[model samples]
Target chain A: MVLYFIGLGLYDERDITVKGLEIAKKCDYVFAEFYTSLMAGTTLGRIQKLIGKEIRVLSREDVELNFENIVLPLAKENDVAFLTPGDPLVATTHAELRIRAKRAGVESYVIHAPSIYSAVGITGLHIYKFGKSATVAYPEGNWFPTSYYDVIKENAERGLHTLLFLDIKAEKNMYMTANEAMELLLKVEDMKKGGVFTDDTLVVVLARAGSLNPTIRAGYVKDLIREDFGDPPHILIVPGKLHIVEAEYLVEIAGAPREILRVNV
Target chain B: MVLYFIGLGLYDERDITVKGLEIAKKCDYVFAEFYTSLMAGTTLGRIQKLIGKEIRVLSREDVELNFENIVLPLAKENDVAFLTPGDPLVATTHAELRIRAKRAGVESYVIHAPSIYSAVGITGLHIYKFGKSATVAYPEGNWFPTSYYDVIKENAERGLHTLLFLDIKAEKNMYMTANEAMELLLKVEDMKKGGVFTDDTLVVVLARAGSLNPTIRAGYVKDLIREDFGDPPHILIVPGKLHIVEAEYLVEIAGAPREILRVNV
Candidate 1:
């Protein structure tokens, strides 16, 4: 028996790769895990209908049960496909399943799709110069997580770009907006009692990535906080040690202040 | 006159977002920067034919030298659309242009597409744990850049993931193979005195992303070097700290060695 692990890519029904689509269509059992990111435009029902297949939505618990009962055993009996948003193996849960399939002697294949991780490379930030990325969760009682700021500050000190992933609770329907994210950063900067993130600090904001209406804006954190960027899924970046190519990109496309951005190495 | 920067997601000619497609068909000047990444099966000619529009191809020189001379004037005279392989602003070059446009009082709009960067978050590796990514450069004089190793080593020390983009020189039609990249890494490891990457150092290889023949495999550096990955456009991830979820996904989806992988943190 064969098992195919598929990544759904960024969004919607059509984002599945050709290999993933073929396998998903033929699989006897199809399961998708949506805990990673929410699908705003296309619902699971739409995806299943679009693919002409029945997909069982697996929750965090369903996937975390260790895949023995649902994924592996099914792979041994029949063709099964586990579909996840983006690339399948990007998540540890999916990685564990591949190991289980290999040990079970089940023939396995992975269909890599466009992932958000590779998008940063597109940013020309010398993906190599970035340090650890941190998430800006929805502030709790206006008490934000200063930890993300600390990480970014640390990365910046070392002349590194900080890829900040904005938080999302798709199940809860709680999507953090980029404006809210910038405010939080400003607060964190204030809390640090130093200049970790300031009004002049350059930031890149990406909203609704993979969606037709995604927004890419760049400017000072303070100015961005006032800019109304419509939508749910978004990410904010605090650039450090900007390369010439990167500075050119931000200036050309993101509306970054050229005077401040031009001199950044 | 408004300038729209659109991203054509990974796929055939139809993968362009509704917004991107709409703006593209009507824009006075439709142009694309093709050096970044390849569409799933779409070529520039195919897209132009499918969309019933003429798209001017911009080379690196065209984009860099004549950002204002070529693109800005068109964008100012009429509605302009600048297209890229993935998310338009994801590339730093594009972002820089947006900054310039805004500075010149030419309003620019960005329409996001499915990017590989954010998709890595699906791995449940805490997307924030990734550091700046580095790509393997074409080998020079029996020495590939050990610089990537230093980047990975630093991230590993901090329990972060180093996204090692396998080099793809689309302009010259050269793709760095996964196995070849692993070999380069070995040399890089040696040059770095085998500090971060040893025989047992875990590496995950993703091949043929956005294609039907995708492959994900993870093992020790040497083991991966020995394995034959079938295609190019591979992404090598050197993971530092593997959370339970991270480790799980690596094993299940990427076929990573669960036993060998340690939670470095």
Candidate 2:
């Protein structure tokens, strides 16, 4: 038996590749887990209709802990398809699941798709210029994580862009917004005083990527923090020194102010 | 009249998302440029047939210099589609073309697709663990570039992986293999004595990504420098330190020997 891991791409049902859709349609069982992400543009019903299959959704614990017992047992008798948002492996720990597939005597294949890791290029910051990425986490009680702030500082010191993945808790139906992420960074700056992310810092927000009209906005944190970016699943980018062409893209396509055009050396 | 910048994804014509394919089919004019990279699994004829539109091939000069003259004018009267391999703006200077579209009063939208920048996650390395990416350029006469070597060193010091985008000369149909990239890094190591990349150092190579059976090989430079990764358009990764899960995946899936697993912190 073979297992196919396909990506639902970035935004919606149509974001999946024709190859992924066709192969998935032929699967004996189509299982998906969206606890890892939230798609602002499409629902599970929409994807199920497009694939022409009854989809079964799994929770993180179900897939992570009981994967060898539950999913692998089905794969032994049937051609099973496991779906996830974006590329099956990018920004995900699911790559380790393939090891389980191998140990269970199942052959597995991965189908690539559009991931936010690559989709950030639309922000006009050069993809190659991006350094190590970090995720912004909501502070809960006494457990406050400020490593993402240090990540931005490290990347900035090297003149490299930083991609900040916002926190998402699917079971609770909580999705962090870019505005909240900016505020968290500001609070971290106040605490650490590392001079990392502050009100004067320029940032980029990409909301609902892979949609026809994704919101690509770049400006100072103070100005954009309160601005409405529309919907959930927003991505924040902290770019270092900008290239002239990159600045032009920010100014023209992403609607950055004229002062940011060339004042940046 | 509208303009669309669509990605052909990583491998074949079927790799394009259903949305991009559907949008391109509705366009009055479809154009593609492949000077940045080549798709080993597909041809222009296949893409043209899939989109059900005549595709005019654009040379590097035609795109870098004459895009405003040749492509934008047509968008004033017709819905035009411009296609490229991978995400349209990722790793390409085509982002500036969007600026020209704004200047020409041509409303342009990007249809995101799979990009190699994020595809490296298939190697089982955490996506967020990757740092600044660099390209390995072939030497021409005295102009030997070793900046990519330095990039790996800097990322390694910070325990971050470095993605090396192999060079490609599409007009000459020349694609830099990972083997060639390894030799260049070794040569640079000999010149600089930075010890960043050596025959004893481990590396990962991902070849023909987006294909069902891509070659994912991980090993020391001494063992893999001459190892065949299969096909052109290869990506090289210099991993800094490996998490146990990351190493195990490489050992089991990518054919790396067990010795490369527990050796790192």
Candidate 3:
């Protein structure tokens, strides 16, 4: 009678809300996709162990191309759910699925969970300062994607922070490290000379959020370019002019250089 | 051994994540404050009943002036938590408090939950297009807070969506409705004449997110100025440009004008 879009939160199985788990526990079928984002803290076997439900894993093509055929057909009679890392509609793919369910006359509901957009709060930067977000994708097949670099330029021009979501090639079993993102940005800087990303540019990295021991680091690009941020699914941030409070938190919590504590603001 | 800053999700008690709820339940003392944002779906009794703990509520003055006095003293011996409606430290004061926690020699952790920042995803606007966010404050005395108005101009110039958080007079027990926000933007437009927020400007209003049935509407300000969005805590969004899919979702799900199907995109 209904289809639910549940989110498996940022890091692990325990990150799902009580409401989402309770809803998914009794669902007739639970379908999840991992191609959108990575869940670095736990395994698929552990997710089933927590919710007491057998899981059905779907490939990107299955959900994107054949969701109506494979998922919605069962929703007509049985209560089914499609789970994704973070919020289901944070991006484009699952949002289209919701509309498909609507046109198919299957009532759909969203069970919200922790998303990295909100999880960026952990970086101690003002969430309101975050400007238009960009993904630092792997420059695919000789294509030099410099849009993310340009976005940082635009945001910094207006004194707004930039949030860069690192790339995930789930099919290739590869996650783009913040180091690689820095390398790409440095390459773009060398080419464009836009002054958007450079050696001394300040950057912040957050890895494996939603876990208690998530790694947080902030420093000059030269200092943190090859620094370890532990595990997959890292978030990179380029801050604009800092509020004194913003700079202080970076120093106190993120192990940023004490010298950066002096804020022009 | 630690201080925990947990968010009681967007709407209610159950909106808290399983990780947050479990952590809150095991805590020795739970301290909470409600002045930052509203929680219309659940009461303190419901939250306390769910967690099975007596919650000590704090005023904004209590939190800002004396969080160390009241919250951190107990945090030294017992695992005390300070709870807020959305993700704690998403606001300025709470982040400073985390620094205070560090200064006082107490370890602190923030448990994640659904926040209006991430809840903006439910509006069907591409979250990535959302630029710098602002709050619409009621013009006080001889001073008018118009920074939020300038924010719209800056984001719109770059073709990015602007998220306007309507202000709240928590002590006065007043919530600025989306209607009031529109009137204020219109007033600002009349004064600034920036063409940023005319009556004909397309806007989206999302009220009471994270609930089963939230009000989601998209239309020009002239048509929606008096429309009832239901409840407090309304979010007004000024979009710059829309993708075809973004326009489709607004038309199909949010009951936007059919003309935008081609015009807005």
Candidate 4:
């Protein structure tokens, strides 16, 4: 008579915590959704093999619309677990899902895992320095998204870093590349001319954050606009004025241009 | 021939990821520092038992002054693991240590884990809304810390939530409670006359974040300043203007006052 919302961490199946894995393995049914973000380092098959259970993958609509009707019904009678790519409640929809579970008289608990929110720390930027976050979206016909650029502007003005989550289309297997996101920002810059994101704007690109050898690059947009990041699920960080230590770490670890030590520091 | 900085997730020994556990167990030497943050739900004995190794605990000085001499030298000949309470690089000092490892011709890799930074999402607040974080420190006889108050003031001006980490003295086994943090904030408010933190201020307290049955409560500070949250490692969230759904979740899941839906949303 319980439901568990478990996070599978940042990159792969093994990212699941021991507690989460134990609970998920013992659950009568396990369901997962990959639309919010995909685990680029592992596949659904790998996760199922590890848990020893056939996971019923849920679509965006299936989870956002019919979660209570489908998943909660089973939770009333058996132990059920719902898994997501990162920490479950980090998504606003998942927080409301817990509310829906309550309305249906089904008890729900959350088992947290590593989220890209914290995974950004791997970029060598202090986590506390980050401000409000935004997502780069795919602009559709007759619709443009510029709010993300504004978030960077607001955060940068206050000397705080901005964490931009790249968009993903799980069903179509389309993940927005950092190159595409940078291009979109440039387009928005051309329209707004806020001096927020320009060719010389320093940025950090992190790919496959949970993987040991994940790529971490820091440079201006012009130099890295076409550089290969080598994977899906890339995160862009627009750092504020860097401390001297932060600049040195970027130079030594991420291979940032030597000029950044004087310019950004 | 490498050093792995692994995170033992938020609460207990079982909170470690399967990948972290595997890497830690295979390491030739295991080193850990609990001063950054301690695992409140488990003891060092239990953690050593789970890893099947005799772990050497490092102090603040051991890690800060002698890390290169002690840990990096060992990593030159064997695979070594340095464990921390949460994600390794979240602490700015740890990121600097990686640079030292590079100078010593030692390779370092980070294994991500759940952190209080992301664990606050369990409070039903949107992770993206969080702004610059601050730590509430214990005031000494001649020194009183109030910079944390200004962080909340600045974040609130931008309508961004503030994640306040309570102070902890691991050497003394002293973890500051949410009540103490609030009292400190109130004292700062009285001295600064900023009118930022007051009795009427709406706040959220999250305790034992990675635990399944962690306590989450939200209300005006007047009503909750003395409320018991149970156990150590509590974090406070000063929410900005809330969205309707955010307010609803606080009311439904966090046992917040229903009036917040109208006042804060």
Docking class of 2: high
Show where candidate 4 strays beyond 4 Å.
A263-265
Number of the candidate with higher DockQ, 2 or 3: 2
TM per prediction = 0.73, 0.99, 0.98, 0.99
lDDT of 3 by residue, B1-265 (tens): 6999998888878888888888989999999999998688888899999999999999999988999999998998999878888876787677888889999999999888888898888878988899999999999899998999999999998999999999997767689999999999999999999899987789999998888778999999999999999997799999988988888889888899998776677
iRMS for all predictions?
5.1, 0.8, 1.0, 0.9
- Please give the TM-score of chain B in predicted model 2: 0.99
Q: What is candidate 2's DockQ?
A: 0.89
DockQ of each: 0.31, 0.89, 0.81, 0.85
Q: What residue pairs clash in candidate 2, if any at all?
A: none
Q: How high is the lDDT of residue A99 in model 4?
A: 92
Give the residue spans of candidate 3 off by over 4 A: none
CA RMSD per model (angstroms): 5.2, 1.0, 1.1, 1.0
Candidate 4 per-residue lDDT, tens place, A120-208, comes to 88888888999999999999999988899999999999899999999888889999999999999999999999999999999999998
Cα lDDT tens digits, model 1, B57-80, are: 888888877877788887877998
Clash count (model 1, backbone only): 57
lDDT of 2 by residue, B1-265 (tens): 9999999999999889999999999999999999887788999999989999999999999999999999999999999999999889888998889989999999999998899988888999999999999999999998999899889999999999999999999989899999999999999999999889988998999999999999999999999999878888899999988888889999999999898777645
Error of 3 at B15 (Å): 0.6
Residue-wise C-alpha lDDT for candidate 3, range A167-201, written one tens digit per residue: 89899999999999999999989998988889999
